[PDB]
Amino acid sequence: TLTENKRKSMEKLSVDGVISALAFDQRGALKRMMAQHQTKEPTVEQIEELKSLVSEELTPFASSILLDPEYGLPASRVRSEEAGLLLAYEKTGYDATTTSRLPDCLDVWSAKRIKEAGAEAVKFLLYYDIDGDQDVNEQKKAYIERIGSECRAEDIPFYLEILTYDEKIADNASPEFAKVKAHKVNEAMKVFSKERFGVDVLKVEVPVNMKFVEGFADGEVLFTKEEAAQAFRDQEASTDLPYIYLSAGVSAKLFQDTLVFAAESGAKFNGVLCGRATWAGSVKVYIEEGPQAAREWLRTEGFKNIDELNKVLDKTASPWTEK
Amino acid sequence: ITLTENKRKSMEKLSVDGVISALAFDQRGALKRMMAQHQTKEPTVEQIEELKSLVSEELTPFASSILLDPEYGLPASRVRSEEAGLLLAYEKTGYDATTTSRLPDCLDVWSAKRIKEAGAEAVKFLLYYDIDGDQDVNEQKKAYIERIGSECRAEDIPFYLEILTYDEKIADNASPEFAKVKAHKVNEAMKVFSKERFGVDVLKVEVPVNMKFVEGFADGEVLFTKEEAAQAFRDQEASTDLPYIYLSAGVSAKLFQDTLVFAAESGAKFNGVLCGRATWAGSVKVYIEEGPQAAREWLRTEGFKNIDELNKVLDKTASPWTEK
Ligand SMILES: [Ca+2]
Ligand SMILES: [Ca+2]
Ligand SMILES: [Ca+2]
């Protein structure tokens, strides 16, 4: 169930069947991060520059890098020759006044254009509430079907990122949401693992908020280590596709411990698409110090970060070739 | 160019001996505008669905295929002649008249896969296009059509792209001012969307002239000689090697027929029609004012006469897409 060219592209995005990909398609989120030191709005040059510094210096240690076509094409051209390229296809964000969080592709892009821009994968982010409005989810399923069809035609892997939410729960970090997160994550993965959607890799959240798991929690506890472990097994059971974890609302150190726990519990996850934590500090150094200092930062603290992550992946991730 | 095995079989189911004699009734906004002329209340779902089912049942025995919309036309699709193929529209009807961009938008709960699953032998999509218009608008439009063309390649189903031209700065398509640029708008738009990257299998296009302003056809101001108009058809033939078929644009049945004759005499090797209002227009007033049965009798007499006389003209004017 993988064409010759999709297989070749998958291999360019991984090392020995493990995806160790660097996520840096942030647009508005990165922009705000940037305005936290300088005065005056951040220029398009700064957005594209730091993306090129991070890409040039850290992709030698990542199997691939996820970039956005709007700001990231220059960064994409200075990436390491041994690192694949994924390009984001979705517009960022969502309308906070509505609960539908409907998906929308970038206006002047298509899967064909993403492939022409050098990408080895189309990445699209979908917000999904399995329990939400039935017609909203019908429109969302139709939308992904189109993108899956596009990616089949262009013979390019389709990486579908799913971020769960609840139309009623405002705060995804609340204990209230944590009680349903396993239901949201795993049922969404079941939906979009159906063949009609054409997905090659699922980029998903871990099916639990570890900050409420015993031994990992700084405060209130809602789950035993055994209840959390079963969520990871339920997740493994929810899809036969390769899937990789994103890092959300946790520290670098907790994310790594989570990878250990995930593997311990029996999850056969196939890697990560992690970003902010690795190139975090470079954002402040870049605005304040000279870009030559952000370089040395990336060559030292930057390398240390992604290297320690790689050492953990080597003992937790499973190769997607097993599937 | 080439057709996959499945795409060719679908094209065969839409055609007879390589000629597309297709009946178009995916009208929605245009249909509601017609029904509104004949009654006070607003048209109901049941009225739209029924009138489409009547045209389908009564006239598809005389067509090689029928084009319907998924919103109101699926019941009509199920009563078409056993011998007739099916195309389904994929675009939302109409455009925003408060801006000049007329951006395309797919039906929200449909996809090429779902159109195929609904029994269609082709996906039809209408695009409003002004070759001379805003360049960023047109880049967005071109990207959109690339997506649809890719979907149809993946689902292995013919892509029928309809192009209706306009000018961002000319309000009335029927005016002499627009008539003077129409050939440019049509022919260059056909040249763009014949590029391989758009995955089009058949173009549904306007004739590249407003015949009401051509010598011999014009009742008022004459803007073009016959040789000038004929050259516009030759330019159109030279703007693509894809199959293309003409839409009627709601002219009279007689004018559309005479335009097809003129097109063939001029050198256009067009491959058929997707003809709607020129065939069934008069049934709307009858259906509204007199009801379903009276509309059946109109379709069986005047409606039949329009499509039969059209079929006779196609037999002596259209060129086959197979023999290329
Ligand atoms: Ca630890
Ligand atoms: Ca060509
Ligand atoms: Ca030609």
Shortest distance, CA B87 to any CA of chain A (angstroms): 18
| A190's tokens | 């079941």
Which position has the token pair 């996959």? B4
Q: Tell me which DSSP letter residue B281 carries.
A: T
Nearest to B189 by CA among B123, B235, B248: B235
Q: Is B153 an interface residue toward A (CB < 8 Å)?
A: yes
The neighbour count for residue B252, using CB atoms within 10 Å, is 13
Between the CA of B204 and the centroid of ligand 2 the distance, in Å, is 18
| A298's tokens | 């990336």
Q: Is A230 an interface residue toward B (CB < 8 Å)?
A: no
Shortest distance, CA A153 to any CA of chain B (angstroms): 5
The neighbour count for residue A104, using CB atoms within 10 Å, is 12
Contacts of B65 (CB under 8 A, 6+ apart): B13, B14, B15, B20, B21, B22, B23, B84, B85, B86, B87, B121, B122
Give me the helix-helix angle, B45-59 and B304-317, nearest 10°: 50
Contact B115, B157 (CB under 8 A): yes
Backbone angles phi, psi at B93, to 5 degrees: -75, 150
Which position has the token pair 């970038």? A106
Q: A110 vs B154: CB contact, 8 Å cut-off?
A: no
User: Which residues in chain B have Cβ-Cβ distances shorter than 8 Å to A87?
Assistant: none
Nearest CB to A146; choose among B139, B151, B199:
B151
Tally the residues of chain B.
324
Burial class (CB in 10 A: 0-12, 13-18, 19+), B320: middle
Contact B153, B4 (CB under 8 A): no
Residues 189-228 of B with CB under 8 A from A: 197, 199
Question: Residue A124 pairs with which residues in a beta bridge?
Answer: A160
| B200's tokens | 């089009």
Nearest to A202 by CA among A245, A138, A140, A149: A245
What distance in Å separates the CA atoms of residue A60 and residue A306, rounded to the nearest whole number?
10
What is the per-residue burial (b if ≥16 Cβ within 10 Å, else e) of A21-50? bbbbbbeeebeebbeeeeeeebeeebbebb
* Distance of alpha carbon A269 from the chain centroid: 13
Longest dimension (CA), chain B: 51
Which position has the token pair 């045209």? B55
What distance in Å separates the CA atoms of residue A211 and residue A254, rounded to the nearest whole number?
9
What technique solved it? Answer: X-ray
Q: Tell me which DSSP letter residue A241 carries.
A: S
Contact A52, A75 (CB under 8 A): yes
Contacts of A156 (CB under 8 A, 6+ apart): A5, A6, A9, A111, A114, A115, A119, A120, A121, A122
Tell me the CATH number at A292. 3.20.20.70
What distance in Å separates the CA atoms of residue B203 and residue B139, rounded to the nearest whole number?
19
What distance in Å separates the CA atoms of residue B146 and residue A111, rounded to the nearest whole number?
8
- Return the ligand number nearest the Cα of B241: 3
Nearest to A247 by CA among A151, A176, A313, A320: A313
DSSP-derived 3-state class of residue B81: coil
What distance in Å separates the CA atoms of residue A90 and residue A113, rounded to the nearest whole number?
13
Alpha helix locations (H) across chain A?
Answer: 4-12, 28-34, 44-58, 73-77, 111-116, 134-153, 175-178, 181-192, 225-237, 252-265, 282-288, 291-297, 303-313
Q: A145 vs B113: CB contact, 8 Å cut-off?
A: yes
Question: Residue A20 pairs with which residues in a beta bridge?
Answer: A272
| B281's tokens | 């227009």
User: Which residues in chain A have Cβ-Cβ distances shorter than 8 Å to B111?
Assistant: 142-143, 145-146, 149
Give me the helix-helix angle, B283-290 and B45-59, nearest 10°: 130
- Taking CA atoms, A272 is separated from A19, A188, B24, B43, B97, in Å, by 6, 19, 51, 54, 47
The neighbour count for residue A119, using CB atoms within 10 Å, is 27
| A285's tokens | 């150094």
Q: Tell me which DSSP letter residue A266 carries.
A: T
What distance in Å separates the CA atoms of residue A34 and residue A13, rounded to the nearest whole number?
29
- The structural domain count of chain B equals 1
Backbone angles phi, psi at A44, to 5 degrees: -55, -30
Contact B199, B152 (CB under 8 A): yes
Between the CA of B194 and the centroid of ligand 2 the distance, in Å, is 7
Question: Residue B23 pairs with which residues in a beta bridge?
Answer: B66, B275
The neighbour count for residue B24, using CB atoms within 10 Å, is 27
Which H or E run contains A246? none
| A216's tokens | 């990992």
Letter for the amino acid at A182? A
Q: Tell me which DSSP letter residue A300 carries.
A: I
Q: Is A96 an interface residue toward B (CB < 8 Å)?
A: no
Alpha helix locations (H) across chain B?
Answer: 5-13, 29-36, 45-59, 74-77, 112-117, 135-155, 176-193, 226-237, 253-266, 277-280, 283-290, 292-298, 304-317
Dihedral of the CA atoms B1, B2, B3, B8 (nearest 10)?
A: 80
The neighbour count for residue A11, using CB atoms within 10 Å, is 16
Question: Residue A164 pairs with which residues in a beta bridge?
Answer: A128
Nearest to A183 by CA among A213, A160, A207, A204: A207
Backbone CA torsion sign across A188, A194, A196, A202: positive
Contact A111, A122 (CB under 8 A): yes
Contact A125, A90 (CB under 8 A): yes
Backbone CA torsion sign across A276, A277, A281, A282: negative
HSE value, Cβ hemisphere, 13 Å, CA-based, for B246: 30
Shortest distance, CA B90 to any CA of chain A (angstroms): 12
A135 → chain B, closest CA residue: B109
| A19's tokens | 């995806």
Between the CA of A294 and the centroid of ligand 1 the distance, in Å, is 27
Backbone angles phi, psi at B87, to 5 degrees: -120, 145
HSE value, Cβ hemisphere, 13 Å, CA-based, for A170: 2
Shortest distance, CA B6 to any CA of chain A (angstroms): 15
Backbone CA torsion sign across A19, A24, A28, A29: positive
What distance in Å separates the CA atoms of residue B190 and residue B240, rounded to the nearest whole number?
7
The neighbour count for residue A138, using CB atoms within 10 Å, is 12
DSSP-derived 3-state class of residue A221: coil
Nearest CB to A109; choose among B143, B153, B155:
B143
Which position has the token pair 């013919």? B158
What distance in Å separates the CA atoms of residue B293 and residue B188, rounded to the nearest whole number?
45
Q: B147 vs A146: CB contact, 8 Å cut-off?
A: yes
Between the CA of A293 and the centroid of ligand 1 the distance, in Å, is 29
Q: Is B147 an interface residue toward A (CB < 8 Å)?
A: yes
Nearest CB to A145; choose among B111, B153, B197:
B111
What distance in Å separates the CA atoms of residue A203 and residue A210, rounded to the nearest whole number?
18
Contacts of B216 (CB under 8 A, 6+ apart): B226
Which position has the token pair 């379903």? B292
Q: What is the DSSP string of A33-99?
A: HHTTTSSSPPPHHHHHHHHHHHHHHHGGGSSEEEE-TTT-HHHHHTS-TTSEEEEE-BPP---TT-S
**Residue B125: domain span:** 1-324
